[PDB]
Design a protein around this ligand. Sequence first.
Ligand SMILES: *[C@@H]1O[C@H](CO)[C@@H](O[C@@H]2O[C@H](CO)[C@@H](O)[C@H](O)[C@H]2NC(C)=O)[C@H](O)[C@H]1NC(C)=O
Ligand SMILES: *[C@@H]1O[C@H](CO)[C@@H](O)[C@H](O)[C@H]1NC(C)=O
Lengths: 49, 49, 48
Amino acid sequence: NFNGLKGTGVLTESNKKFLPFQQFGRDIADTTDAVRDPQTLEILDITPC
Amino acid sequence: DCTMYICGDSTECSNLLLQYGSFCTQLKRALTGIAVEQDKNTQEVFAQV
Amino acid sequence: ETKCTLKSFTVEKGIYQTSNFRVQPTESIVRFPNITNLCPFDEVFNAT
Ligand SMILES: *[C@@H]1O[C@H](CO)[C@@H](O[C@@H]2O[C@H](CO)[C@@H](O)[C@H](O)[C@H]2NC(C)=O)[C@H](O)[C@H]1NC(C)=O
Ligand SMILES: *[C@@H]1O[C@H](CO)[C@@H](O)[C@H](O)[C@H]1NC(C)=O
Protein backbone atom coordinates (compact mmCIF):
# COMPACT_ATOMS: atom_id res chain seq x y z
CA ASN A 1 0.00 0.00 0.00
CA PHE A 2 1.72 3.24 -1.04
CA ASN A 3 -0.36 6.36 -0.37
CA GLY A 4 -3.60 4.34 -0.58
CA LEU A 5 -2.88 2.34 -3.77
CA LYS A 6 -3.84 -1.24 -2.88
CA GLY A 7 -2.07 -3.87 -4.96
CA THR A 8 0.03 -7.01 -4.84
CA GLY A 9 3.32 -7.52 -6.64
CA VAL A 10 7.09 -7.85 -6.43
CA LEU A 11 8.75 -4.53 -5.60
CA THR A 12 12.10 -3.98 -7.32
CA GLU A 13 14.24 -0.92 -8.08
CA SER A 14 14.04 1.38 -11.11
CA ASN A 15 15.31 4.75 -12.35
CA LYS A 16 12.35 6.43 -14.05
CA LYS A 17 12.26 10.23 -13.86
CA PHE A 18 9.03 11.73 -12.49
CA LEU A 19 8.02 15.36 -12.26
CA PRO A 20 7.35 16.57 -8.68
CA PHE A 21 3.62 17.09 -9.35
CA GLN A 22 3.43 13.76 -11.21
CA GLN A 23 3.02 10.91 -8.71
CA PHE A 24 1.23 7.86 -10.14
CA GLY A 25 2.17 5.97 -13.28
CA ARG A 26 -0.20 4.24 -15.68
CA ASP A 27 0.09 1.96 -18.71
CA ILE A 28 -1.98 0.87 -21.71
CA ALA A 29 -4.40 -1.01 -19.43
CA ASP A 30 -4.90 2.06 -17.16
CA THR A 31 -3.34 0.22 -14.20
CA THR A 32 -0.83 1.46 -11.65
CA ASP A 33 2.56 0.09 -12.71
CA ALA A 34 5.24 2.51 -11.44
CA VAL A 35 4.59 4.35 -8.18
CA ARG A 36 6.55 6.62 -5.76
CA ASP A 37 6.92 5.97 -1.97
CA PRO A 38 5.23 8.73 0.12
CA GLN A 39 7.79 9.10 2.97
CA THR A 40 10.76 9.33 0.51
CA LEU A 41 11.02 10.48 -3.17
CA GLU A 42 12.14 7.35 -5.04
CA ILE A 43 10.36 5.78 -8.02
CA LEU A 44 10.14 2.11 -7.14
CA ASP A 45 9.62 0.06 -10.35
CA ILE A 46 7.33 -1.28 -13.06
CA THR A 47 7.44 -4.94 -11.98
CA PRO A 48 4.52 -7.31 -11.38
CA CYS A 49 5.03 -10.93 -10.37
CA ASP B 1 -4.24 -17.93 -19.33
CA CYS B 2 -7.54 -17.52 -17.63
CA THR B 3 -7.08 -16.79 -13.99
CA MET B 4 -4.56 -14.06 -14.83
CA TYR B 5 -6.75 -11.97 -17.12
CA ILE B 6 -9.90 -12.19 -15.00
CA CYS B 7 -8.15 -12.02 -11.61
CA GLY B 8 -5.09 -9.89 -10.93
CA ASP B 9 -2.98 -12.76 -9.51
CA SER B 10 -4.98 -12.73 -6.27
CA THR B 11 -6.37 -15.52 -4.08
CA GLU B 12 -9.94 -14.38 -3.35
CA CYS B 13 -10.75 -14.13 -7.07
CA SER B 14 -9.05 -17.43 -7.96
CA ASN B 15 -11.36 -19.40 -5.65
CA LEU B 16 -14.49 -17.63 -6.94
CA LEU B 17 -13.76 -18.53 -10.57
CA LEU B 18 -14.26 -22.27 -9.90
CA GLN B 19 -17.91 -21.53 -9.02
CA TYR B 20 -18.49 -20.54 -12.65
CA GLY B 21 -16.75 -23.81 -13.51
CA SER B 22 -15.64 -24.75 -17.03
CA PHE B 23 -16.40 -21.47 -18.80
CA CYS B 24 -12.65 -21.07 -19.49
CA THR B 25 -11.54 -24.56 -20.46
CA GLN B 26 -13.89 -24.05 -23.36
CA LEU B 27 -11.95 -20.84 -24.17
CA LYS B 28 -8.43 -22.38 -24.19
CA ARG B 29 -9.55 -25.41 -26.13
CA ALA B 30 -10.54 -23.01 -28.95
CA LEU B 31 -7.42 -20.81 -28.97
CA THR B 32 -5.44 -24.10 -29.06
CA GLY B 33 -7.58 -25.28 -31.92
CA ILE B 34 -6.74 -22.07 -33.77
CA ALA B 35 -3.08 -22.20 -32.70
CA VAL B 36 -2.69 -25.67 -34.23
CA GLU B 37 -4.27 -24.81 -37.60
CA GLN B 38 -1.66 -22.08 -38.10
CA ASP B 39 1.05 -24.73 -37.84
CA LYS B 40 -1.07 -26.82 -40.23
CA ASN B 41 -1.70 -24.00 -42.73
CA THR B 42 2.00 -23.49 -43.41
CA GLN B 43 2.74 -27.22 -43.62
CA GLU B 44 0.33 -27.70 -46.55
CA VAL B 45 1.20 -24.52 -48.47
CA PHE B 46 5.00 -24.74 -48.58
CA ALA B 47 5.77 -28.42 -47.87
CA GLN B 48 4.30 -30.21 -50.88
CA VAL B 49 7.75 -31.75 -51.50
CA GLU C 1 -0.91 -31.81 -13.16
CA THR C 2 -1.61 -32.94 -16.72
CA LYS C 3 -3.64 -35.67 -14.99
CA CYS C 4 -5.30 -32.93 -12.90
CA THR C 5 -6.02 -30.08 -15.33
CA LEU C 6 -7.29 -32.51 -17.99
CA LYS C 7 -9.60 -34.48 -15.61
CA SER C 8 -8.62 -38.00 -16.63
CA PHE C 9 -6.25 -40.78 -15.61
CA THR C 10 -4.65 -41.82 -18.92
CA VAL C 11 -3.16 -39.16 -21.19
CA GLU C 12 -1.78 -39.49 -24.70
CA LYS C 13 1.49 -38.44 -26.29
CA GLY C 14 1.63 -34.68 -26.74
CA ILE C 15 2.16 -31.30 -25.10
CA TYR C 16 -0.30 -29.78 -22.63
CA GLN C 17 -0.69 -26.58 -20.63
CA THR C 18 -1.24 -26.85 -16.87
CA SER C 19 -0.57 -23.54 -15.08
CA ASN C 20 2.00 -20.75 -14.78
CA PHE C 21 4.75 -19.71 -12.36
CA ARG C 22 3.47 -16.33 -11.19
CA VAL C 23 4.98 -15.48 -7.80
CA GLN C 24 2.50 -16.08 -4.96
CA PRO C 25 1.83 -13.51 -2.20
CA THR C 26 3.65 -13.94 1.11
CA GLU C 27 2.90 -10.91 3.30
CA SER C 28 1.07 -7.59 3.68
CA ILE C 29 3.14 -4.40 4.47
CA VAL C 30 2.41 -0.58 4.32
CA ARG C 31 4.51 2.66 3.96
CA PHE C 32 2.42 5.91 4.31
CA PRO C 33 3.78 9.59 4.28
CA ASN C 34 5.91 11.53 6.84
CA ILE C 35 3.72 13.19 9.49
CA THR C 36 5.29 16.62 10.37
CA ASN C 37 2.04 17.26 12.28
CA LEU C 38 2.88 16.99 15.97
CA CYS C 39 0.31 18.34 18.42
CA PRO C 40 1.37 21.17 20.77
CA PHE C 41 1.73 18.77 23.71
CA ASP C 42 4.99 20.16 25.13
CA GLU C 43 3.08 22.82 27.06
CA VAL C 44 0.42 20.21 27.89
CA PHE C 45 2.86 18.00 29.83
CA ASN C 46 5.90 20.19 30.59
CA ALA C 47 4.41 23.49 31.75
CA THR C 48 5.98 24.86 34.93
C1 LIG D 1 10.65 12.95 7.96
O1 LIG D 1 11.27 14.24 8.13
C2 LIG D 1 12.44 14.24 8.96
C3 LIG D 1 12.89 15.68 9.09
O2 LIG D 1 11.79 16.54 9.34
C4 LIG D 1 13.50 13.32 8.36
O3 LIG D 1 14.65 13.29 9.19
C5 LIG D 1 15.87 13.61 8.47
O4 LIG D 1 15.60 14.15 7.15
C6 LIG D 1 16.77 14.51 6.40
C7 LIG D 1 16.29 15.09 5.09
O5 LIG D 1 15.34 14.23 4.47
C8 LIG D 1 17.67 13.28 6.22
O6 LIG D 1 18.87 13.68 5.56
C9 LIG D 1 18.01 12.66 7.57
O7 LIG D 1 18.75 11.47 7.38
C10 LIG D 1 16.73 12.35 8.34
N1 LIG D 1 17.04 11.79 9.65
C11 LIG D 1 16.40 10.73 10.15
C12 LIG D 1 16.84 10.27 11.51
O8 LIG D 1 15.50 10.16 9.54
C13 LIG D 1 12.93 11.92 8.19
O9 LIG D 1 13.88 11.07 7.55
C14 LIG D 1 11.65 11.97 7.35
N2 LIG D 1 11.08 10.64 7.23
C15 LIG D 1 11.42 9.78 6.27
C16 LIG D 1 10.74 8.44 6.31
O10 LIG D 1 12.25 10.06 5.41
C1 LIG E 1 9.12 16.88 28.88
O1 LIG E 1 10.44 16.81 29.46
C2 LIG E 1 10.94 15.47 29.59
C3 LIG E 1 12.26 15.57 30.31
O2 LIG E 1 13.32 15.85 29.40
C4 LIG E 1 11.04 14.82 28.22
O3 LIG E 1 11.46 13.47 28.37
C5 LIG E 1 9.70 14.87 27.50
O4 LIG E 1 9.83 14.37 26.18
C6 LIG E 1 9.16 16.29 27.47
N1 LIG E 1 7.83 16.33 26.86
C7 LIG E 1 7.63 16.51 25.55
C8 LIG E 1 6.20 16.52 25.10
O5 LIG E 1 8.56 16.67 24.77
